[PDB]
Amino acid sequence: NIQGITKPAIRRLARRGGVKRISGLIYEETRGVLKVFLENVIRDAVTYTEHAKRKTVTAMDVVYALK
């Protein structure tokens, strides 16, 4: 579940992203951003899995959904 993406992880990600200070509201915003992205990619990865008649999502399957 989504609250399992922690404040510290979000700051490390932001730090790596060059962000220096952040609003308290970034935390929930960043979670919204990741839920949506994951839902898009995953739904596509799985759809292509399913299409190829497999039942095991591969690394090219994910890589397709990114494309």
CA distance 24 to 33: 15
Environment class of 45 (CB within 10 Å of its CB; exposed 0-12, middle 13-18, buried 19+)? buried
Question: Residue 33 Cβ, how far from another protein at the closest point, in Å?
Answer: 7
Residues with Cβ within 8 Å of residue 55, at least 6 apart in sequence: 49
5 is a site residue for another protein (CB under 8 A): yes
45 is a site residue for another protein (CB under 8 A): yes
56 is a site residue for another protein (CB under 8 A): yes
Q: Among 7, 46, 51, 53, which residue sits at the site for another protein (rule: CB under 8 A)?
A: 46
Structure tokens at 34: 């990741």
Query: x/- binding map, residues 8-37, to another protein, per CB under 8 A?
Result: -x--xxx-xxxxxxxx-xx--xx--xxx-x
